[PDB]
Design a protein around this nucleic acid. Structure first.
Ligand SMILES: [Mg+2]
Ligand SMILES: [Mg+2]
Ligand SMILES: [Mg+2]
Ligand SMILES: [Mg+2]
Ligand SMILES: [Mg+2]
Ligand SMILES: [Mg+2]
Ligand SMILES: [Mg+2]
Ligand SMILES: [Mg+2]
Ligand SMILES: [Mg+2]
Ligand SMILES: [Mg+2]
Ligand SMILES: [Mg+2]
Ligand SMILES: [Mg+2]
Ligand SMILES: [Mg+2]
Ligand SMILES: [Mg+2]
Ligand SMILES: [Mg+2]
Ligand SMILES: [Mg+2]
Ligand SMILES: [Mg+2]
Ligand SMILES: [Mg+2]
Ligand SMILES: [Mg+2]
Ligand SMILES: [Mg+2]
Ligand SMILES: [Mg+2]
Ligand SMILES: [Mg+2]
Ligand SMILES: [Mg+2]
Ligand SMILES: [Mg+2]
Ligand SMILES: [Mg+2]
Ligand SMILES: [Mg+2]
Ligand SMILES: [Mg+2]
Ligand SMILES: [Mg+2]
Ligand SMILES: [Mg+2]
Ligand SMILES: [Mg+2]
Ligand SMILES: [Mg+2]
Ligand SMILES: [Mg+2]
Ligand SMILES: [Mg+2]
Ligand SMILES: [Mg+2]
Ligand SMILES: [Mg+2]
Ligand SMILES: [Mg+2]
Ligand SMILES: [Mg+2]
Ligand SMILES: [Mg+2]
Ligand SMILES: [Mg+2]
Ligand SMILES: [Mg+2]
Ligand SMILES: [Mg+2]
Ligand SMILES: [Mg+2]
Ligand SMILES: [Mg+2]
Ligand SMILES: [Mg+2]
Ligand SMILES: [Mg+2]
Ligand SMILES: [Mg+2]
Ligand SMILES: [Mg+2]
Ligand SMILES: [Mg+2]
Ligand SMILES: [Mg+2]
Ligand SMILES: [Mg+2]
Ligand SMILES: [Mg+2]
Ligand SMILES: [Mg+2]
Ligand SMILES: [Mg+2]
Ligand SMILES: [Mg+2]
Ligand SMILES: [Mg+2]
Ligand SMILES: [Mg+2]
Ligand SMILES: [Mg+2]
Ligand SMILES: [Mg+2]
Ligand SMILES: [Mg+2]
Ligand SMILES: [Mg+2]
Ligand SMILES: [Mg+2]
Ligand SMILES: [Mg+2]
Ligand SMILES: [Mg+2]
Ligand SMILES: [Mg+2]
Ligand SMILES: [Mg+2]
Ligand SMILES: [Mg+2]
Ligand SMILES: [Mg+2]
Ligand SMILES: [Mg+2]
Ligand SMILES: [Mg+2]
Ligand SMILES: [Mg+2]
Ligand SMILES: [Mg+2]
Ligand SMILES: [Mg+2]
Ligand SMILES: [Mg+2]
Ligand SMILES: [Mg+2]
Ligand SMILES: [Mg+2]
Ligand SMILES: [Mg+2]
Ligand SMILES: [Mg+2]
Ligand SMILES: [Mg+2]
Ligand SMILES: [Mg+2]
Ligand SMILES: [Mg+2]
Ligand SMILES: [Mg+2]
Ligand SMILES: [Mg+2]
Ligand SMILES: [Mg+2]
Ligand SMILES: [Mg+2]
Ligand SMILES: [Mg+2]
Ligand SMILES: [Mg+2]
Ligand SMILES: [Mg+2]
Ligand SMILES: [Mg+2]
Ligand SMILES: [Mg+2]
Ligand SMILES: [Mg+2]
Ligand SMILES: [Mg+2]
Ligand SMILES: [Mg+2]
Ligand SMILES: [Mg+2]
Ligand SMILES: [Mg+2]
Ligand SMILES: [Mg+2]
Ligand SMILES: [Mg+2]
Ligand SMILES: [Mg+2]
Ligand SMILES: [Mg+2]
Ligand SMILES: [Mg+2]
Ligand SMILES: [Mg+2]
Ligand SMILES: [Mg+2]
Ligand SMILES: [Mg+2]
Ligand SMILES: [Mg+2]
Ligand SMILES: [Mg+2]
Ligand SMILES: [Mg+2]
Ligand SMILES: [Mg+2]
Ligand SMILES: [Mg+2]
Ligand SMILES: [Mg+2]
Ligand SMILES: [Mg+2]
Ligand SMILES: [Mg+2]
Ligand SMILES: [Mg+2]
Ligand SMILES: [Mg+2]
Ligand SMILES: [Mg+2]
Ligand SMILES: [Mg+2]
Ligand SMILES: [Mg+2]
Ligand SMILES: [Mg+2]
Ligand SMILES: [Mg+2]
Ligand SMILES: [Mg+2]
Ligand SMILES: [Mg+2]
Ligand SMILES: [Mg+2]
Ligand SMILES: [Mg+2]
Ligand SMILES: [Mg+2]
Ligand SMILES: [Mg+2]
Ligand SMILES: [Mg+2]
Ligand SMILES: [Mg+2]
Ligand SMILES: [Mg+2]
Ligand SMILES: [Mg+2]
Ligand SMILES: [Mg+2]
Lengths: 272, 49
RNA sequence: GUGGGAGAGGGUGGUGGAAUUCCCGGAGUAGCGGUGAAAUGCGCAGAUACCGGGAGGAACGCCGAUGGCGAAGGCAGCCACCUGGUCCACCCGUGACGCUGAGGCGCGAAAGCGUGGGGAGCAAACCGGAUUAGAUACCCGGGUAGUCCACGCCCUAAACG
RNA sequence: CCGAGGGUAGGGCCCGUGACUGGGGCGAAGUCGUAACAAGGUAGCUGUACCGGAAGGUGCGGCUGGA
RNA sequence: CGCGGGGUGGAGCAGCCUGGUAGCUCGUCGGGCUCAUAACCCGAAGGUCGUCGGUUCAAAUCCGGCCCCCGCAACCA
RNA sequence: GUGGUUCGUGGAGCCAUGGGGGAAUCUGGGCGGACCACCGCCUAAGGCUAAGUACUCCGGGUGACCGAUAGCGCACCAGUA
RNA sequence: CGAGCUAGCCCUGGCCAGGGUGAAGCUGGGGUGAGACCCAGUGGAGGCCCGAACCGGUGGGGGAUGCAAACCCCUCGGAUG
RNA sequence: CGAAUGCCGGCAUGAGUAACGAUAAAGAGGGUGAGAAUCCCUCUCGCCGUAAGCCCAAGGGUUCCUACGCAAUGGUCGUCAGCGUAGGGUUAGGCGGGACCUAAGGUGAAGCCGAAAGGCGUAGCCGAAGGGCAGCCGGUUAAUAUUCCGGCCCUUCCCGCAGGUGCGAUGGGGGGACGCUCUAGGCUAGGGGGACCGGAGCCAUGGACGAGCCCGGCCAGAAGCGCAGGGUGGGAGGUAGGCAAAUCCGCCUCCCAACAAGCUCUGCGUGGUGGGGAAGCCCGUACGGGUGACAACCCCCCGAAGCCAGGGAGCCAAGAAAAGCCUCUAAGCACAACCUGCGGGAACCCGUACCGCAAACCGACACAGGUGGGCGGGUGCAAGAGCACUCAGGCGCGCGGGAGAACCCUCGCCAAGGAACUCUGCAAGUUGGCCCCGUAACUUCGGGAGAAGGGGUGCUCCCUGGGGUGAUGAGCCCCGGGGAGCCGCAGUGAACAGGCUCUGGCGACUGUUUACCAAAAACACAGCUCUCUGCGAACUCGUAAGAGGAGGUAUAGGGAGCGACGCUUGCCCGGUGCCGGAAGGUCAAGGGGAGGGGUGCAAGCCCCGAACCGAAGCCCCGGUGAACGGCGGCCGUAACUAUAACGGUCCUAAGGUAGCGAAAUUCCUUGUCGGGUAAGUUCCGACCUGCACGAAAAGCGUAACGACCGGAGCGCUGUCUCGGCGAGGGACCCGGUGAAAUUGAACUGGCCGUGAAGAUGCGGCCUACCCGUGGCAGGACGAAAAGACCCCGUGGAGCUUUACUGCAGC
RNA sequence: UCGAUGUCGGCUCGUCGCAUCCUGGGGCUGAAGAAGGUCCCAAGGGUUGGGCUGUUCGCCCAUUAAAGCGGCACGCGAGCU
């Protein structure tokens, strides 16, 4: 989708909005299973650690289910599909037959009315979740766990997905939304299908405000400020850095790798 | 234009208050000295009810 | 109409080996590549040559033919689904409802453009090596848009019988 | 009231004109290379796209006006 | 005015700083191949080294004086 | 690796130690300025211990000390206005 | 010791007269094979428009031991973000 | 002590000078009084009036009220006061705060961390203009009142009786409970009219004894009705989730509704009864009191932004929590308890005065400044919180009187010209609101656009079509059209109310910034691109524990540059940086001991110490520029001259492409040619010889936007020729109060000399009676600041880097 | 003169020198006349309006009897911009 606009105001011409057709007549969220008071704040205890944040629409947290072995075997019916301000993926709310309700990040396909479930059993269909081993090599899938019982963590962004590649001992090779081939443990669930609402990468914010709404204040270039507060700074009419591009704190930012070398997680990785 | 003193009872006891100064090691010393110097008033005289 | 027939005609989805390139494991050295001849180039940090495993993309050998189909462009591994045209027999039905077609309207290789994906081989531009008086070329080694896909544009051709 | 004509103002069309610039034509015997015609010494021609002092080159696809 | 760089056969460049020995590409001349010109092949010629001085036995080469040439600085007021 | 000592790595011991190795019970251990030999001195890794020394919010004495611009910031309702 | 000025941010409350302009989406009619699309009427968008409060502080002028250690008059910018 | 721009204190000078804090404005009579422009009174006048009037909040803390008072405080006066002395004055179960709750944030048992002091921290507490929660209207005081009193109306507790029910939790669930903008229906507040009703009155000056002028025609109100609207389905089986249990909730499943039909709950009428009550006239106030009055206390019309409120429609950025309240159960208990009536008793603490856009708060001051929320009437102007006048209510701004010079400020007008003014139309003018005609290039199809340029605009009569409320009608009120005619110089007759265009530069655009000299072409910005980060992420803070990132997960997050959009972004990896290289070469600790030394008679004990093995870094090998950067010189050549498509040669890592170019970059320079002018160092279009453009420190464009900057034309003008008058506030004069910086001391003249080279002061001559007031600024190297540039001092700070040396971090 | 002497231009107000731009007088002329050249005497008065530039300055435009050079802290900021 992606709503468009006629130019009746510069900016609201290039501006592009999402299409909330996929939003089952829902909107008002569900008390109980979410929401919780969401403590918004751009800095830690005192100081500001991440810069340029703050401001932007008030938000309510939708406490989603990111570990599904909670209900192994208990099937549930997908009730609605709603908007979640805390993420890029739309989310689906679903009523188990157990009578319990919980939200799930909604996969592309999954339609309201559908029945979905989790566990070793589970049929390989959009929405169902199973330990990685039991999933057919090659099938795509989202909401992966990295270590058994620790909760989903990979491919959860709007319309992202990972594809299974092979098996190898108690591990199974994956291919993350980034292109890295990772070795994940067999016992990590991963609900099947891709995340959906993949038009998300196409929304043209539009104006200055639009960014402000999502809570992101203006970002000033180092080049603009002085030597006192950033490498690229001073002296006359602009300047060409004058040294290898660096961050406010001073480490190179055009090429310098960061992953800490001797990490134990190294051996389970294979790509880029 | 607007100036720098905008009186506020709450802020004043809340900041230069007595329990305020007792709470920290530096403030307790603030008291010591003032006590040791004589000062009729150890801390500002906030008021009302 | 009834009943049959051929076909790479169109769309969508799914799928099979062959080979190429990269990757790792093996084992093996002293050269491989390349041309008219050579050099660039690749290689004792282990190349080329062989075995095994893996990834991925594109094109689909033999069948293939001077063949079939399509209105033109064009269309080829294999499977299913949805679909158009089309020839035959039976002479059953309507009963002149026909031809053409300014304009409009859709279609329309390749290259090009847009936003997103993909990217193996090839490959403008470009980089070296030869060749020449000089080569911005023909040859050689590299190599990016592109070629591939989705939606959207563009409307050209020796769109040629 | 209307009203020739006059006046204010903005458009349409058409002709002359202008530093300078893009191409085109013509101008017996100036410069540079040789692309085409013989297989033209790289078959050519092409729509197109990039590049080159210039003819041009090369990329993708088509054609016989060639093998 | 000041700083440093440079004048070499016809053209463009080496040659010095560690003084004795001028080298390269082109061009020019004679000869070949071609019907002829170019290419290509065979041979040959050409340099008071910007000038006036001395330094040494000996100066393109070391050192001062001028003749042009090129580049850099001419700031605070 | 360092601190302490006069000791700034110096021939740098002794006394404290963060790190790592890691003993012995008198024929056992330390020290006497690298080290070794004699010759000597001491007995580490538990603790307590008066008096002699410091100071002066406070009390009394004395001043070749001040005398209200001095002497404490204040002689006086000052850490006050 | 200070964020009772000022800068950001967090929590929770308020404020924005009155006018213009009229997006999408609807409904209707046109159109077609079904469309795209076109008309109306409707609707009421927007870091839109005019301009008070409210927030600024553009040009000039006065003030310059001032009314004022930044002020006054005229004039001007934003004014549902 | 004579000087230190010395310290402290006192007193001079300027000086009776400048001032007396908004140009809203005063006059007179009468009082009082020792003494009035300045106090009381009254009469007249002027100012505000979406306030300069009321009402809350903060803050202030006696300022409130009374009497008695002027020495000081008042910018003069003062009998007055916000001042001095003293006495009084602030009434609450219902308004606000607490014995209710929770947000950020604080705190903090547990837990963790830290040389110490301390840092962190789920549970619990605290934290308020948020949620919850029971009061309306009048009367009284010199001063308080939703507090006192009157009428009416509510709330919890406790103890009784009288009934009902399994009652019962800090535990389960429900609810409370939420954005923006646009909105409906009906109400209320509030406002207009009235021939009707109620009133003391009044014919003024030529007319009017009249549906005449004037004044007012309400307010609260329990139950119960009535009119609006808000909420919510009822049964019944089945259950494995709501961390125990539930009959409640959730989820299947059948019934009946699908409606508000029924319960509720709000507000809004009406309601027993209760209270108000104008002008004007009489009074005595500092003010209110009495008559009016047995007051009347009714019909329409406008109507909210407020109420019904958890109303609805849309949209995207997707919009607190906890308690009260309802229900469900556990222990316990079921002679308890809790529910509904009904009585009777109990209801604490603190705030209440007054100021509160201001003389009581913030600004040293009775300071033209600043300060959150609510009410803010009428008329006309298209509308309004705009504007002009005026309600109620509050004011005339705590120095006056005259004068009527210069000059200043603020304002008005002007002959002829109209930009000649000037750095520049700077300023001032013109133009302005509304309705209707009519509008270009360009363009991203919206815009440009209020383009431009034009007409209409008052009042009277006639005729006529729509709405609303009433009933399909009167009235009442809102909108339309036509037709005649009237008067002015002029009809948005006063106030509020764009000058317009053409063409460059820059940045897309709304936005932001140097609080107190810079609002821009600067920052920001959507958008692009590079690059890091697989999650106990990267990165940032912190010694840590921690925390942000993020309760996110590659369509996400950190860093960097460019900056909408269009068309594009060419070459060099030689140096630097980053990336990729299980080879090497070097390389520290440590491994290793060939071998040498010191002592011992010795066994021993003590030092050195070579091969060799030893990382990361570096060297070396590759790659990468939307990484740091860079992107040539000299000669020759065309059948006119000229010039070079062609060539040679030297050096590069490669040798600037497109596109732009005398530019926001052009030194020479006003390059040269065209355009604009009578004339054009600027501007505009060209040319290219680019001192010294050029492709993400982006190149060249661009509709639109702009308090940006340049050029130009129209229009209009006191900008100017070139001034002139007038106005008001000062200046001037008298009375009252009365500063300041400065100052070696002063009996302080010109010329020409002279001197440390710029003389009132030394020289000669010249002039020159003593002392003032208004003026002008040439001088006193006038005042103000131990010069802010310059240099010096082995002075200091901020910044940079392949300067030296450390340090954190890796 | 650095315990401060404000600095280019414009403007307003002027004053002075004369090595005179005009007009007054004159000698010589290669001065027929007219209009010129050139010198000598003479400052008494006059010595314009625009275009461009911050400009001094110059360059032009339309005139003029002429469109003089200089000094006065590149006169003049307790007078202005
Ligand atoms: Mg909730
Ligand atoms: Mg803290
Ligand atoms: Mg930025
Ligand atoms: Mg800066
Ligand atoms: Mg820096
Ligand atoms: Mg038949
Ligand atoms: Mg017939
Ligand atoms: Mg046909
Ligand atoms: Mg096509
Ligand atoms: Mg194609
Ligand atoms: Mg994109
Ligand atoms: Mg290739
Ligand atoms: Mg050749
Ligand atoms: Mg090739
Ligand atoms: Mg053909
Ligand atoms: Mg023309
Ligand atoms: Mg031409
Ligand atoms: Mg030729
Ligand atoms: Mg040829
Ligand atoms: Mg060819
Ligand atoms: Mg081609
Ligand atoms: Mg030491
Ligand atoms: Mg020892
Ligand atoms: Mg000893
Ligand atoms: Mg010894
Ligand atoms: Mg001893
Ligand atoms: Mg002791
Ligand atoms: Mg004393
Ligand atoms: Mg004395
Ligand atoms: Mg519409
Ligand atoms: Mg609107
Ligand atoms: Mg707006
Ligand atoms: Mg300003
Ligand atoms: Mg506005
Ligand atoms: Mg002395
Ligand atoms: Mg003194
Ligand atoms: Mg005086
Ligand atoms: Mg005077
Ligand atoms: Mg005076
Ligand atoms: Mg006054
Ligand atoms: Mg008296
Ligand atoms: Mg008035
Ligand atoms: Mg008092
Ligand atoms: Mg009083
Ligand atoms: Mg009195
Ligand atoms: Mg007085
Ligand atoms: Mg005063
Ligand atoms: Mg008093
Ligand atoms: Mg109590
Ligand atoms: Mg509490
Ligand atoms: Mg609490
Ligand atoms: Mg704490
Ligand atoms: Mg509260
Ligand atoms: Mg209450
Ligand atoms: Mg009162
Ligand atoms: Mg119960
Ligand atoms: Mg409960
Ligand atoms: Mg609850
Ligand atoms: Mg009469
Ligand atoms: Mg009532
Ligand atoms: Mg349970
Ligand atoms: Mg009465
Ligand atoms: Mg609602
Ligand atoms: Mg609680
Ligand atoms: Mg009170
Ligand atoms: Mg009160
Ligand atoms: Mg107010
Ligand atoms: Mg006053
Ligand atoms: Mg005031
Ligand atoms: Mg205000
Ligand atoms: Mg109102
Ligand atoms: Mg109006
Ligand atoms: Mg007003
Ligand atoms: Mg005039
Ligand atoms: Mg006139
Ligand atoms: Mg005119
Ligand atoms: Mg002019
Ligand atoms: Mg002038
Ligand atoms: Mg101008
Ligand atoms: Mg102006
Ligand atoms: Mg302009
Ligand atoms: Mg801008
Ligand atoms: Mg400023
Ligand atoms: Mg500001
Ligand atoms: Mg601005
Ligand atoms: Mg974390
Ligand atoms: Mg912190
Ligand atoms: Mg978080
Ligand atoms: Mg990123
Ligand atoms: Mg930039
Ligand atoms: Mg920029
Ligand atoms: Mg580039
Ligand atoms: Mg490199
Ligand atoms: Mg490079
Ligand atoms: Mg390299
Ligand atoms: Mg490396
Ligand atoms: Mg190494
Ligand atoms: Mg140029
Ligand atoms: Mg001209
Ligand atoms: Mg010109
Ligand atoms: Mg330049
Ligand atoms: Mg540039
Ligand atoms: Mg660049
Ligand atoms: Mg730019
Ligand atoms: Mg702006
Ligand atoms: Mg004037
Ligand atoms: Mg006057
Ligand atoms: Mg006087
Ligand atoms: Mg005298
Ligand atoms: Mg003198
Ligand atoms: Mg004397
Ligand atoms: Mg004298
Ligand atoms: Mg003077
Ligand atoms: Mg001075
Ligand atoms: Mg000094
Ligand atoms: Mg300087
Ligand atoms: Mg030094
Ligand atoms: Mg001096
Ligand atoms: Mg000086
Ligand atoms: Mg002085
Ligand atoms: Mg003569
Ligand atoms: Mg003379
Ligand atoms: Mg002009
Ligand atoms: Mg003069
Ligand atoms: Mg001079
Ligand atoms: Mg000068
Ligand atoms: Mg001067
Ligand atoms: Mg002076």
């Amino acid at each position: 989708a992606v709503k468009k606009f006629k130019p009746y105001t510069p900016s609201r011409r290039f501006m592009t909005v999402a299409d909330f057709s996929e939003i089952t007549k829902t909107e008002p969220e569900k008390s109980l299973v979410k929401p919780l008071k969401k403590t918004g704040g751009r800095n830690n205890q005192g100081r500001i650690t991440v810069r340029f944040r703050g401001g932007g629409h008030k938000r309510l947290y939708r406490i989603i289910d990111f570990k599904r072995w909670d209900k192994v075997g208990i099937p549930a019916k997908v009730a609605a599909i709603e908007y979640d301000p805390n993420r890029s993926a739309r989310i689906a709310l679903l009523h188990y037959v157990d009578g319990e309700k919980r939200y799930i990040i909604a996969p592309d396909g999954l339609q309201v009315g559908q029945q979905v479930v989790a566990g070793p059993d589970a049929p390989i269909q959009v929405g169902n979740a199973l330990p990685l081993r039991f999933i057919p090599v090659g099938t795509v899938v989202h909401a992966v766990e990295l270590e058994p019982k620790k909760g989903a963590k990979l491919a959860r962004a709007a319309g992202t997905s990972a594809q299974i590649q092979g098996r190898e001992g108690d591990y199974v090779i994956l291919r993350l939304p980034s292109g890295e081939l990772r070795k994940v443990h067999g016992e990590c669930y991963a609900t099947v299908g891709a995340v959906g609402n993949a038009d998300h990468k196409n929304i043209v914010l539009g104006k200055a405000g639009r960014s402000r709404w999502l809570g992101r204040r203006p970002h000033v270039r180092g080049a603009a400020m002085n030597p006192v507060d950033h490498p690229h700074g001073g002296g006359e009419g602009r300047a060409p850095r004058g040294r290898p591009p660096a961050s406010p704190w001073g480490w190179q930012t055009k090429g310098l790798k960061t992953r800490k070398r001797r990490k134990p997680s190294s051996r389970f990785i294979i790509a880029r | 234009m607007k100036r720098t003193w905008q009186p506020n009872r709450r802020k004043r006891a809340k900041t230069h208050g007595f329990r305020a100064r007792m709470r920290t090691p530096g403030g307790r010393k603030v008291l010591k000295r003032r006590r040791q110097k004589g000062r009729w008033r150890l801390t500002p005289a906030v008021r009302k009810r």
